[PDB]
Amino acid sequence: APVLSKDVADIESILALNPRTQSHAALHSTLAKKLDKKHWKRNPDKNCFHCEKLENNFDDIKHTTLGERGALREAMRCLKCADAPCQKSCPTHLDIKSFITSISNKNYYGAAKMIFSDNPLGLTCGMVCPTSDLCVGGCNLYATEEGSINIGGLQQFASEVFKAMNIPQIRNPCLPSQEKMPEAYSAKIALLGAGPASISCASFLARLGYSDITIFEKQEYVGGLSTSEIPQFRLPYDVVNFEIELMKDLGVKIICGKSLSENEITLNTLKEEGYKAAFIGIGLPEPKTDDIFQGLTQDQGFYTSKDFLPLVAKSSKAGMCACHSPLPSIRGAVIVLGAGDTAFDCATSALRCGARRVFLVFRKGFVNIRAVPEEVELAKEEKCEFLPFLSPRKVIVKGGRIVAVQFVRTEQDETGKWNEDEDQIVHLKADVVISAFGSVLRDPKVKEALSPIKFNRWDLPEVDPETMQTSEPWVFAGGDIVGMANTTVESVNDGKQASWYIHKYIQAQYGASVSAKPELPLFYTPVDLVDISVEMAGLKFINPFGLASAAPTTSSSMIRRAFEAGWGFALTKTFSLDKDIVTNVSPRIVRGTTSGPMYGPGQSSFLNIELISEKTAAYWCQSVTELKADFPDNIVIASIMCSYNKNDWMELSRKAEASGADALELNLSAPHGMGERGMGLACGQDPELVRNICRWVRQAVQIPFFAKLTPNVTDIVSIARAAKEGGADGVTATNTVSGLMGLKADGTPWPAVGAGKRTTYGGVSGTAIRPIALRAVTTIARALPGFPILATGGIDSAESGLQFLHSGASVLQVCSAVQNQDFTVIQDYCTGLKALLYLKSIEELQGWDGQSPGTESHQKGKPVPRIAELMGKKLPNFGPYLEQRKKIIAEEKMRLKEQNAAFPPLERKPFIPKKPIPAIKDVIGKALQYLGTFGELSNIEQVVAVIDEEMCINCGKCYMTCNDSGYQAIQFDPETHLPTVTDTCTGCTLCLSVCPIIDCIRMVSRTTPYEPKRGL
Amino acid sequence: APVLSKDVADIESILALNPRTQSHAALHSTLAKKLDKKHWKRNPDKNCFHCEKLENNFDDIKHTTLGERGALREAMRCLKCADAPCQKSCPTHLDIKSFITSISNKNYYGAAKMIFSDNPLGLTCGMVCPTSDLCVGGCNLYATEEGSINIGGLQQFASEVFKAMNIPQIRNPCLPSQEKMPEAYSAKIALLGAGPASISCASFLARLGYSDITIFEKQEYVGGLSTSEIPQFRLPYDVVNFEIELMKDLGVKIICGKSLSENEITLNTLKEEGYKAAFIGIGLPEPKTDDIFQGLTQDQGFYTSKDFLPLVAKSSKAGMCACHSPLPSIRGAVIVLGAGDTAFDCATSALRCGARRVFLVFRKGFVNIRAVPEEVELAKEEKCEFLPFLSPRKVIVKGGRIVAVQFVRTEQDETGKWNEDEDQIVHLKADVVISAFGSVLRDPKVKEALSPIKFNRWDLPEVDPETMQTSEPWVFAGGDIVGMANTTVESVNDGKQASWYIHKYIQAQYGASVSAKPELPLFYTPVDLVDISVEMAGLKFINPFGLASAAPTTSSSMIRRAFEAGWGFALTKTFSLDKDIVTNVSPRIVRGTTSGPMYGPGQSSFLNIELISEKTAAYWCQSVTELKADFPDNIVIASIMCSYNKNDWMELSRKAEASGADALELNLSAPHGMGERGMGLACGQDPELVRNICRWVRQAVQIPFFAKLTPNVTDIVSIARAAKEGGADGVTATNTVSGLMGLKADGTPWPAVGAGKRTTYGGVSGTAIRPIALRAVTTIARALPGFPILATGGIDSAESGLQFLHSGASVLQVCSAVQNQDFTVIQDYCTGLKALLYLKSIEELQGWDGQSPGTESHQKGKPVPRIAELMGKKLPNFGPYLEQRKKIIAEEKMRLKEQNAAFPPLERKPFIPKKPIPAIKDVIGKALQYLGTFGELSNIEQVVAVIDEEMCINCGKCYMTCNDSGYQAIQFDPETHLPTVTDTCTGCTLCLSVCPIIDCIRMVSRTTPYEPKRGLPLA
């Protein structure tokens, strides 16, 4: 037959682009290189001066937006620091460490709950916060080459997933029923203006239990600037609606078309109507004007930011206003005056209206720009021109329209004073002029309505910076109107701050006092009501998470703090009789090398050569008595160890039982014998020894006890069965895996002890051994149905915990995840498990995998345009293909503009459980039904790989894996770098396994009878 | 006794900043927050308009510089793409995929070798290449939120490590001896100008074997613009010297003080002197001038970039010149005219000279700036002011000094053209003016020296863009002088391109032809001569790396390509007799979840439920015959499997032997007949069955055979011993670990097969099982000294491979590392192992760990200034503390400027092996001496953790780990966020294990005797 070990022509051809080591240096002329470079170009071209058409294009342009794949990577990178500087730098004091930890553990619900607990507008802020000047500006990772964490994008992602869950906010469960609430909580409360400040203030007051809260809004739309001015391409209106509805879930009422103004609503009319407190959150309603613009109209081409931005918003935000308004017709050159946030949004928004060119003109220099670099970047990347040191002097109008603006030179002299040079002028041609000089409060009727509160020299309501209280005790203020806040988050914080003192004030008015220490409630939803208790071997666990017998339980004081944090149970470090006292060596605990040279958070494993507790049995027994006395509902299991001696095991187990331990855990690590009988050296490796030890203990104590099994055995089931036959009430699976973590290049080990640099085999723990522990738990669960199992081995999240429950375990022990972090992870594990169970009752979310929404086609986490004009056209996101995609998208936007139509956000409506929420007992062992022998697997129902071209990032890893580890079934296009799976695919699934994009490749049922390649 | 389970006051205090979940929302006023924010500030403050003192400060300001920690992370992130677009976008076509792969595997030598093979100025380019407009601009990862790879910084890092190794370049090993070289290679070759272009050209010609190469340089210094103008704070002079010395290692001669000029060296004098070929690489020697600056002197305050930058370079670059040069005195406001690379370097350099303020003024708009964004960013972050649309008209001079510059306004019209508005002027005050209008070749004497070559309409030497040849056959040109190159890398490529055709031309002149296909040699060093062959069980392996019996050996055609790539040996996929033919299911191979939701490169493991080969024994046996016929020196081992039947094992083993296999590997995964004793179910789990199977095969064949052991046993040594007693020539340790990779939230498994979404236990492979495999190999090696062991289990680099060799294995099998990449990793493994062995002979590098230099105090990978006024001040790199550090550093720079000196430049000298380079046989089992029982470990020689404040990034992880997983022995300062290990430390070593900064924490011998905490006195 032909040469079997040679590729035929067809395969040789398919392997054309497969990596091969070159034996010589390559030769390619500089000219050839210049001509080839443009074909692969991904990023902006420095030599390109035009901005892709953006007319009527309101797609998200934020650089911080993240998809799940990207969010998980960034969340894992976060160091999750103690006393985190990022949190200290966040105006609402968000517990960034905790919410990012939750995201890293795939607990998006927990992350969102943490975010909204401190910031009711968590999604809006995640999208618009100028992080470089806030939280991110203080991030410790700024001290690394890779840089600071994208905190805003992470916050946005978790909040977006929560929004998708369609779960409502609920009243505080710890609160008395509505009818049992003191009279004071029915006090009529009024807030003016429905912006971030009032929304936040009303939200917190509602959390506190106040039942009569009304926000009076002047306009017909709600959300304040988030709605009327911030562009849709930075902050989607549906986000604002989402946060407003969450607030309304608490009973807050909003009345539009009502203004704080003389002859309308005034502080006097409110007081007269019985309102007990009022919060002023009307912001700065008017534009800062300039004499040189007097009399100019929109028809001539002049707008203040207050005129222009709301026009664009009303036209691009479906759901904002009830009308359908065409977009402002901005043609020609546009001059935007100013250098604050507003100026840049006017510049980018002008492009959406059709502007041919946009000039951002400021009276100072580049160094003096007010907006954060990230905001400036957006206008810069869209090719807006920047003209520094120019002050407006005259606007030229001809034929009823603006045609130019004359400026004068500005300059800083020595003394630092900014001066204008009359003799140095600039005549700039322009068709449209937009002033972005800021906003103010001027309306005499509005100010009069605030009588008689004191106004400062800035002509703004004066308030105490700590209480947000005005000169009138019952009146408070916050947000832009106070003149301190520069952001949405600070305005939110102003309302938050004010809510506590408004509460204090109202309570006092009803003769009631409040805690000296501020106690604003957290954010709650129905998920928090989910019961995650479980019963095992006659013991009641408040939650299935506990500390394994290990470093985290080195001292009983640590267990106390763990219980205080919320852990369901805990194991004492293994202890023994005085005669068996041990002494540890050092170093003894090292990081795993199981996932490469990655240091810091999330070590994939640890290796330890630590012995049992160095503390005495007397210490542990007295400690157990104390712990059980102070934490009666938290389970305490005493871990004990003796040599193979009946009297010892009986003596120690009885001492532990007498201390008040809920149960005992038998550590079977003690040696015995020679070592060739095929059953190792430890007692736990010999069924006969295990059976006898359990018999001795069963005979000595009445409380339940579990045998902790080692995975270092041929058949762990035989050991489990022996423990059961001996009388054990269950087994703990499993202890550490024996191993050697590695050696340095010189051959010395790590850990290395003493001058001799010696070491001994240690135990591997962590996620790296989870596959071993998961197998152990499932095999035991299948062989001994109903026999209690306490799982241990790489549990580091609610998700992984649920995997073990599904595999047959009743409770979950943790060590490494805590060594990688701290005791507070229990908060993440509990909210995470509640969410996973809750979601199982929601019919409309069945397509999700736990808390992960079904993956949708995207690029950089942003949804791919499903335009018929782009589908199947094989247009990669680079070079000339990218240009084509941009042209097609632009044309689509123009078409959407011609056919003015749409507005159905189909009002937000919460999903309701359509079945009982599963209890832990309902999920235990549910995965066992899928496990079996290889013979039970169908070899008829085969699959093949299918690639989603739209999600591909053209790396060719699928191609390389199939070539050198598969069946050479993928074609990799030499021009587009797009892969195509051919009919020779066998469905091995390696390509999907190495793809960097989650769900880009999927395995689907084969459409033709499969035929094994026999080579023959 | 007191409450034992409660922390006493002092511990409660130490735990003050320990994480605790809050039960209520926090309350902090907006004002309080505004006041607290400045204390923790890390990045630049947007409201800061002032320029931090940079006078005489030439510290590295590149944002791309990487330290080992950072380089490893970035290298692992790289997708190591096929037909990589980054490489296509690199002017010198560097194999970025390969060099980055080597860095991720800790093989810095291999990475540097790959880099220098295609770019002789690899270090300079790593530091100065405008990557956003080159390699990085085409990076596939740009399509991800985290963004493109820092290719330049990675190149810089690998090259810097190689530079530190002090290893010389050597002549091409496959070249005939110097004496046996054809006469043509002695042809006298001349190159004009010692810049990137000529250095590259001379280097490649030298690689080809030419022995008489001379570069004539006009100045007294070498390196061209890299030396004379690129700032020391972007490109250290020692980098240039390094690359020059590497070139000189090949025999290239450099003569300074010699100019290509009519009254000196000309093409005619060279031809007359017998030179056979000449390369013109003199760049653009003169500044582009403007009539408005006529007559202005430096004393008045005027400089062209050609006057200014060299002055700064000569004073800041130790070694450049023989005389110490003063730093130009630039005081007051400085105006830099232009928007190209030069303008920005003039602006930043002006600040080092003491400028109070710097204005970058250009005649076009911001969008029209020529320099890449990264270059612009440096001037921007240093507070340089930018003034667009201004064209210079007059330099106002009063009192013999420039006091201002008058400009006119500019603008683009309705067609794109640019105009100047006379009526719109600007009068800008300034004390110094620096024109950065570019450079040109104008000297008539230099042009005349190039007669009679043709010049184009641009007034530059004309050359064929493919051959770099001028109108005169024996004269070539490249670099800036040609006018196409815009970068160092392109100039380097011009010289590279030219070397091949210069070679072709010279050979032809001597009546010899050259290959139609270009064959420039790679870069070589003594490391490449290191022997990594090894003998085991009577078999000779050219190198210890081979493909394990697995997916990568699914087909014999794949093994062929693997051998073509360089793999030492390979196992066939396990095959059997026709009656035992199997049929796979799908899906069957999935990624590991052992290191979290990290997708793409470097999966920490894989799980498979694949069976043995679906191809017949006939296919495999014929394939083995073919492979051994075509690759006699590559070892082929046939993996076979039968049920527990004597006749079957004897039949199959004989069939495999008859095919010509060098040896056999027995797969012991076949089940037995009913159990009876936690003896698993597979033959490989029962010593008795293993012994019998090996006995049957031993009686059947004469070639060596190895038993592949499963790690899924209580005592693997008992199985290894059984195989030995049975007659096996060795054992393969080990096969995959039994496991379940995971379940989806709905409880279904992955892999999930069929409509029933079923699965079965699979085998875990990859780095996640390496600890298990390493234990297996070491225990067998200790129990059966000298018994051959073939290692398998997480081997993915030369470094990890050496760990197994040290543990007792002779050869190394690989599977997962290839599944994660491709066959070309063998190149990294071989150069990596050669480097590791070579370095063991270098006495001056004993403090290194393999290829890793000892870690020094760094922040962001940049050396921490060892200033007396900083060490021990407890000044973290943030908030007010950072301000103080900067003030101290600035004062130090001023003192160095005043406490003058700096003639100590070194005499670059290669390290020479001071002992024989170890062979593989010399390292095997060397680690065993350190392994023993727990009782053999000293409990007297204890250690404690010690933290290097200067390397700390204030995360508090050490603190949190000791608090909830240790002994509450670390104090974490509430103001500086600096940790301090106290005397209660027990040396458990957890803090060091979780610290994100490599070597920030170190374990040191306890200075006080250790007393175990018993909690309660022992009675």
Ligand code: SF4
């Ligand atoms: S499932 Fe396997 S045979 Fe199919 S295209 Fe992916 S690596 Fe290749």
